[PDB]
Symmetry: D3
C-alpha cells in the first residue's frame, strides 16, 4: 500500500514467503523471482497467470548469474530470502549453508556496490533474517548472524541505498520436540507487513524486529490433539529451547517504536539505554486459554 | 610433558601464543610455524637458535600453499591459531575475518580429509577458539563460532583423527572501556596448558573450556594507576560487556571434569543435565582485594 | 536381482526415478542420494524409514562437494540422473543446463579418474540420458548428447571401470502440444530395468537403448477425455515433433540384442551394418485401439 | 562493399577464413585479429604491410584477456571463428573443444552484455558455425550447436545489438573417406559473402544458411586422379556420411530468401510451414560431369 | 610541496616508507593506507591522530578487495610499495613473492584499466622498485623487474594516466655479509623525494633513477664498531656483491636530468646513446673518510 | 644412447626442438607430446608413422589438463619446452608469457609434488631455458629466469626426483638487427645433446650450460649475401646486443666440466671461486674466416 509501481526482485521467492509477497504486491508491481527449481516457477506462473511475474532460474551461490540477472532487471527493490527449510541439517552439511547464506548474500550485495552505476533504479535492499541469528547456537543461525553484519557493513559505505534487515520467529503458516520449548507467534501476513514496514520506515543499517507474543509449543500441540496422540521426539542437533529476538548487547542500541523495534547500526555511537534486557520467547507467554483464542481468530 | 618426540605444526605461530608454545615444546619436539610475516620468522630464529624450529611463509587463506605445506611436513599435531588482534576492526572489514578464520580453517581441515592418505602421522587437530564464539554478537565471534562447528563436523566423518577445540577468555600476558565491563582472568601459560590438556585428554568433537575466576576490568586498571590517570573510552563497535564461555544450550551437553569442562559434540544424543546454566564473567567475580593478590602472584 | 550387497550412489535421486530405484534396491543394498533439496530428503527418510538410505545435501555443480562425497561413500555403483524437469526453459537459461548437465557430469567423472586410488570399490558408472540427445535440436538435448560423449571418453582411458549410458524416451509415470506429435511409450519400471540391464549386461563405452512401441500423443489424450475437453497449446521453444532413439550415424555401430540395442563406442572400428536406419517414434505407431489396451494393462 | 569505415574484430582470424576476410575488407576498414599463435601474426603483418591490421595475442578461453581486448578496441563488428581444424580429434579431447568453442564464445558474449556501457561502437556480432551443428553426431558439432543457441539467447535479452550466426559446409579452398560420402560445395569467397550478407541482411537471432549444390566426394577425388591412385581410408570417429544444413525441426521456422535461408529464432512464435523438410548433401547432387565443369570454373 | 590537496592511496603504507610518506604529506593531503596487519594500523592512528589518515585492511593479492577499495577511495594518486623485507627468503618460497609482487601489481593495474570509468580522479600511478630489478639474479629481483615491464605496458595502452616507476638502492634508515660488498647510499627522505619527483616530473612509461654515491659495506660497519666486534656471515642465497641501477641495455635509452636519470619506455624508438654504460655501486665509491663525513651529517 | 626404454613426455614438443628430440629417441623410447595445435600433431604422425609417438591436445596453462595428462602417461622423463617464438612480442602482451612460462611450469612442477604417489616412474624433469634468462632485460627473459628458480626450488624439497635446467643461446637450425650484435653459435643437435647430458650427468638443482663459440651476426649475414642485399632494421623492443650465459653472481657457483658448466643450486653453500667472471657472446668471437669454415662444415 506504500509499495506501488515498483519492480521488486526476490531471491528465493518461490516458497511460502515468496508466494505471499507475490499475492500481496502483484496487482500494483512488477515481481521478479530468482530461484533454482523451475517446477515451482511453472506452477507459480499457472497460479498468478500474469506477465507481471517473471522467474529467473539461478542459484544465489552463482555470482555471474546473480550479477547478470540483477543488471537485466534493474529493480527498485531487492529482497533476499533464500535459505533451506530444515535448519538442523546445516549442522553436518555446513558448507551448504555458508554458501547459500553468506556467499549468496555477498554476491547480491557486491553487485549493488561494484555495479552501482548500472543500477539506476535500486532504492532498497531487504535481507530477511531469523531469531536464530540472535545469540546464535547453530551453524544456520551463525551464518544468518553474519549476513546481518554484511548488510550493516554495506550500509556504512554505500550511502545512497537503503540496506535493512528484518528478524523474526516462527511463522505458523502429532509431534512434540520438548515440553519446555517456547517460540514467538507470528503469521505469514505479519512477515510481509514487517518486510514492507522495514523498507518504508526502517533506516539504512537497522535491523527491525516485531513485537510478538509467545507460546509453549506444548500448549499448541495439545490443542490440535483435541480438535483432531502426541509423540515427544527429542531436541534436534543445534536446537535451542527458546527463540531470542534481541539480546542484551543489542538492547543497548534498540529504539522501540510501538509495534516494531529498530536495532541501530553498530557504527552508530548512540547509547539508547544501559538498562540492558533480553527479548525472548521465555517471557510474556500466552496461557493455553489465550493461545486457543488466538489460533481460533 | 605428555607431548614428546612429536612434529607440531602451528598455523599463526609467530605471535604470543605461538612463541609460548615454542618455548614450552621445542626442547622435545619439532615445531613448524606457518604464517605471513617473515620479519617475525627472522627474529624468532635468532631467539631460539634451533634447527628444531622451521618457519614457512604463507597465508592460511591460500589453499594451495596450505596443502603443499601440510603434505611436506606430515605433522603428528596441527594447531590452528591464526586471526587478527584488534577484533573490533573485523566489523567493517568482514571479508577479511571470514577469509582468515572460516576459509583458512576449511583449507586446513580439507587437507586432513582429501589428503588423508598422505598424512600418515597426523593424530590430532586443535582449533584455538574464544569466549567471543559463545552466543556471539560480533563478526569475529560469529566466524569463530562457525569454525568450531566445522571442527565438530570433521570429527563426525573422520574417525581416525582427534579434532578438538579450546575456548578461552582474555590472556593478561591508562584506558578503560566501561566501568561495568567484566572478563575472565587467565595467563599465557594457562592457554598452553589448556591446549595440551585438550590434545591429550579431550575427545574428538569436544570443545574444552577452562574453569576461571573473573574480574571487573575497572578493579584492575585502578590498581595499575597506583603502582604507577584513567580515561574512560566508550565500548567499541560489536563489543559486549562480559565474556561468556558456556551458554544455556551448550550447558545441557557439558561434562565437568574438575579444572576443565568438556562440551560434548552436537551429534552426541547424550543429555547431561536439563538444569541449564550460563558460565560467564558476570558471576563469581573477584573482589578488588582478591584481584590484587592474584596479579601480585 | 543381479544387484545385491552393493553401495549405490545416485546423483539426483530424490525425484521419480530416484525414488523408484530406492524402492527397488533398498532391501538388499545401501543407497546414497546426492541432491540439493533437503525437504525431499526429509520426506524420503520418513517414507523408507531405513538406515540403508543416506542423503547428502549438495549441488552436482560443486566439484569440491561432489569429490568429498564420493570419497566418503566409496560406492560400488554410481548413477548420474541430475537434471531439470521442464526441458524447454533451458533454452533461455542455457548456462543453467550446461552447468548442471555438462559440468556436473565432468565433476563426477573427474573424481573417478583423479581420485581412482581412493575409490577401491567403484565398478560401474551409469549416466542416464534421453532420446533428446539423439540428433539434438534444443540446448537440453545438445548438453545431454555431450554428456554421452564424455562418458564414452572416460571409457577409452580408464579400463578398470565400466562406464555406460542408457537413453530413453518419455516415462508415463486436458492439454495437447500438437496433433502430430509422437513419443515412445515406457514406464518408470522399464527405466529401472534398463538401468540394471546396462550396469550388468552393457559393456564399457556403450550407450544402451530400449526397444519400445510408440504413440500419437493425441490418441492418448483423447482416451483420458472419455474416462474423465482438450486445449491445443502450441509447440514449446526447441521442441520436436517426435522422439529419436538411434540416428543413421549411430545405426552403423548398433548391435541389437533382443529387448535392447547396444550402440558401440565411437573408438570401436567395427562396422555393424552399412544399411543405415533411424529408430524413431514416427514408426511402428500403436493404433488408438492398441494404445487403449496398453494403458489399461 | 556494405561494410565500410568500420573496426572489425575477429577471434581466430589468423587462419584461412581470417586471411580472406582481411584481404576483402582491409582497404576500407580497421581489422583486429585475436588469436594465440604469434608466428602467424608476424607473417600476416609481413604480407599485408598495413597499420590497419592489428594482432592481439590471446586465447579465447581467457575471459580476462578477451574482455580487456574487446574494451581496448571498441569494435563496430565482432566475428567469432576460433576452433580447431581436425574436428575428429575433439572426440577424445572433449574438454579442449568445450573450452575453445562454448567457453570461448560465452566469454565474448558476456563482455558484450556486462560491459555494454563501455562498448559504444558495437553493432553486430557474427558467430561462424558449421553444418556439423545441425542434428549433431559428434562432440565438435554438439558444441557448435550449443554455441548457436547461446547467440540466439543473447539476441533475446540484448535488443540493441544484432547477434547472428552463419552455418555452412566444407570450403574447397590421394585419399578417400568413403565412397558414399557427400558434402556441400562452397568456396572461401562464398564464406565471406555469407558472413557479410548475415551482418547486413540477417536479423538478430537468426541463423543464416547458404543455398549450395552438393557432390559425391568420390566423384571429386576421381577427377584429381586424372589431372594428376586413391586409398580408401575408413570413416573417422564421429564422422557422418553427409552434411545437413537444415533439419526438419528448423525447417518449420526457416524463411527462404533466394540465395540464403533465414532460420528464425526459437523464441519467435511464427510457424512458416508445417510441411517439414531436411536440407542435406544427399539431395540435389551434381553429376560427375557437372562437378567437373564447376571445379574448372 | 607540489603534491597538495590530493587523495593519495598507498598499497603497503604501514612500513618505513609508508610512514615517512604520511609524515611528509598528511598536513596537506588525504592519505589512505592499504595493508594486511591491523596492529600497525592501530599504532599509526595513535601516532598521527588525524582523520586525514585512513587504513584499509586487505591483501594486495586479493583482486576483489583491491578493486572494491580503489573504487571506494577514487584517489588522485596511487603508490604501490607492498613487498617483504627479508628478500632472500623469497628464494625457496617463490609463490609468495610472485603473488604479492606480480599478482598484487596486476590487480591494482587492472582496476585502473577495467574500472577506469569509475576512477574519475586518478592521475598518477607510481610503482616503487629496486636496484635488484636491474639485471636481476634472484627471484625477488626478477619479480620486481617484471613489475616494471607491467607498469610500462599499461603506459602504452592507457594514455590518460601517468604510470611511472622509481628504482633505488638501500635506504640507511655487528654483522658483515662480505668484505667486498658494495651498496648505493640513500636515506628515507631521498626515497620520498624520488617518489614525488617521478610523480611530478617523470613521464608516463619512464623508470626514474636517483644519482647516488656508493660505499663499501665494510667501511661502514668498521665505523660503527668504533663509535660503539664484527662477525663475517657469508653471502645469502641469491645475493649479489653489488647493486646495479642501470645496465648497458637500459643505458641506451636513459636521459640524464641532473639529480635523476629517466629510462625511456621500451616502446620509444629513441636511441639516446650507443656508448652503453653500467651504473653500479662498484664505481664512484666513497673513501672511508668520505663515508664517515656523510654518515655524520 | 643413454636414454633407452623410457617414456619421455615433452610439453611443447611439436616445434623444432620437439621434432628433433622425436627423431633422436623414437627408435628406442615412447614419446608423448603435449601441445595446443593439432594440425602439427596430424603432420607429425604422418611423418614418423609410429605408435611410439602419442600427441595430447592441451595448453600448459591448464592445470587440470596438465595434471590429468601426466597421471595418464606416468612418464620416466618430463621435458618442458613450451614458449612463443617471437620473444619481443611478449613485451606488450606480458600476461601471455607469464601464463605460458611461469604458470605453465608451476602446473607441471606441482603435479610432480602433489601427485608424486601416482607417478611411480618419474625420474627426471628437464626445463629448457635460454641465455635471455641470464641477467634478463626483457619480460620473456625475466619469466624464464623465474622458471629456473622454480625448478631449483622443487629440487630443494623433493629429493627423489632429478630437477635440472639447461640454458642456451640461438640455434641456427636479407635482414640485420644491428652491426654490433653478437650471439652464441649452436645447432639443433647440440641442443638435444645438451638436454641428454643434463638428464644423465646433471645433478638435481643444477643449471647446465654449453661451451660455445660466438659470432658477429653481421659476419654471418654478409656471407649469405654472397652465396646468394642487406637491410639494417633496428633493435627490437627489449632486445640486447649480446647473449650472456653465465653472469658474475652465477660464476661464483659454477663448476666447469669440459664441454659443459654446471651452475650449482643457490642453496648449496659451496663457493667455487671468488674470481668472478661473465660468460657472454662478446668474448671469444670467431673471425669471419672462422665463421665461414664452421657454417661450411
Ligand atoms: N517459519 C519460517 O518459515 C521462517 C522463515 N524465516 C526466513 O524466511 C525466509 C524464507 O522462508 P520461506 O519462504 O518459509 O522458505 P522456503 O523454504 O519456503 O523457500 C525459500 C526459498 O529459497 C530458495 N532457495 C534456497 N536455496 C537457494 C539457492 N541456493 N539459490 C537460489 N534460491 C534458493 C528456494 O527456492 P529453490 O529451492 O527453488 O531454489 C525457495 O524459493 C528465509 O530467509 C528464512 O530465514 C525466518 C524465520 C522463520
Ligand atoms: N587474549 C588473547 O590474545 C586471546 C587469544 N585468543 C586466540 O588465540 C589465538 C592467537 O592469539 P595470539 O597469539 O595472541 O595472536 P597474535 O595476534 O599475537 O598472532 C596471531 C598469529 O596469527 C597469524 N596470522 C594472522 N592472519 C594470518 C593469515 N591470514 N595467514 C597466516 N597467519 C596469519 C599471525 O602471523 P602473521 O601476521 O605473520 O601472518 C600471528 O602469528 C587466536 O586464535 C585467538 O582467537 C583467544 C582469546 C584471547
Ligand atoms: N571447410 C572449413 O574450413 C570450414 C570452416 N568452418 C568454420 O570456419 C571457422 C574458421 O575456419 P578456418 O579459418 O578454416 O580455420 P583455421 O583452422 O584455418 O583457423 C581457425 C582460427 O582459430 C584460431 N584459434 C583456435 N583456437 C583458438 C583459441 N583457443 N583461442 C584463440 N584463437 C584460437 C586459430 O588461431 P591460433 O591457432 O593461432 O590460436 C585460427 O586463427 C570455424 O569456426 C569453423 O567452424 C565451418 C565449416 C567448414
Ligand atoms: N632499503 C629498503 O627498505 C628498500 C626498499 N625498497 C622498496 O620500498 C618498498 C617498501 O619498503 P619498506 O617501506 O622499507 O617496506 P616495509 O617492510 O617496511 O613494509 C612494506 C609494506 O608492504 C606491506 N605488505 C607486504 N605484503 C603485503 C601484502 N601481501 N598485501 C598488502 N600489503 C603488504 C606491509 O604491510 P603488512 O605486512 O601489514 O601487510 C608493509 O606495509 C618496497 O617496494 C621495496 O621494494 C627498495 C629498495 C630498498
Ligand atoms: N633458437 C631457439 O629456437 C632457442 C630455443 N630455446 C628454447 O627452446 C624451447 C623450444 O624452442 P623451439 O622448439 O624452437 O620452439 P617452437 O616455437 O618451434 O615451438 C615451441 C613449442 O611450444 C608449444 N607451446 C607454446 N605455447 C604453448 C602453450 N601455451 N601450451 C602448450 N604448448 C605450447 C608449441 O606448440 P603449440 O603452438 O602447438 O601449442 C611448440 O610445440 C623453448 O623453451 C625456448 O626457450 C632457447 C634458446 C634458443
Amino acid at each position: 500500500s506504500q509499495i506501488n509501481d515498483k519492480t521488486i526482485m526476490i531471491f528465493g521467492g518461490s516458497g511460502s514467503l515468496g508466494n505471499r509477497l507475490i499475492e500481496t504486491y502483484i496487482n500494483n508491481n512488477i515481481i521478479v523471482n530468482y530461484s533454482r527449481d523451475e517446477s515451482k516457477h511453472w506452477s507459480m506462473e499457472l497460479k498468478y497467470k500474469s506477465d507481471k511475474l517473471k522467474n529467473i532460474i539461478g542459484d544465489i551461490r552463482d555470482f555471474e548469474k546473480v550479477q547478470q540477472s540483477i543488471m537485466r532487471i534493474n529493480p527498485d527493490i531487492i529482497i533476499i530470502a533464500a535459505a533451506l527449510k530444515h535448519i538442523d541439517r546445516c549442522e553436518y552439511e555446513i558448507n551448504e549453508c555458508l554458501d547459500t547464506n553468506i556467499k549468496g548474500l555477498q554476491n547480491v550485495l557486491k553487485v549493488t556496490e561494484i555495479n552501482r552505476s548500472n543500477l539506476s533504479n535500486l532504492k532498497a535492499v531487504c535481507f530477511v533474517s531469523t531469531d536464530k541469528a540472535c545469540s546464535p547456537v547453530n551453524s544456520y543461525g551463525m551464518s544468518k548472524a553474519i549476513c546481518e553484519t554484511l548488510v550493516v557493513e554495506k550500509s556504512k559505505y554505500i550511502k545512497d541505498i537503503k540496506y535493512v534487515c528484518v528478524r523474526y520467529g516462527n511463522v505458523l503458516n502429532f509431534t512434540l520436540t520438548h515440553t519446555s520449548m517456547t517460540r514467538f507467534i507470528m503469521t505469514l501476513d505479519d512477515s510481509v507487513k514487517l518486510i514492507e514496514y522495514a523498507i518504508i520506515n526502517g533506516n539504512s543499517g537497522e535491523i527491525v524486529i516485531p513485537k510478538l507474543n509467545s507460546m509453549y509449543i506444548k500448549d499448541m500441540i495439545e490443542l490440535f490433539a483435541d480438535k483432531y496422540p502426541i509423540v515427544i521426539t527429542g531436541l534436534r542437533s543445534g536446537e535451542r529451547m527458546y527463540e531470542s529476538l534481541i539480546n542484551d548487547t543489542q538492547s543497548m542500541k534498540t529504539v522501540p517504536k510501538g509495534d516494531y523495534y529498530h536495532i541501530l547500526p553498530t557504527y552508530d555511537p548512540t547509547i539508547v539505554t544501559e538498562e540492558f534486557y533480553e527479548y525472548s520467547s521465555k517471557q510474556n507467554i500466552l496461557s493455553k486459554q489465550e493461545l486457543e483464542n488466538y489460533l481460533n481468530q
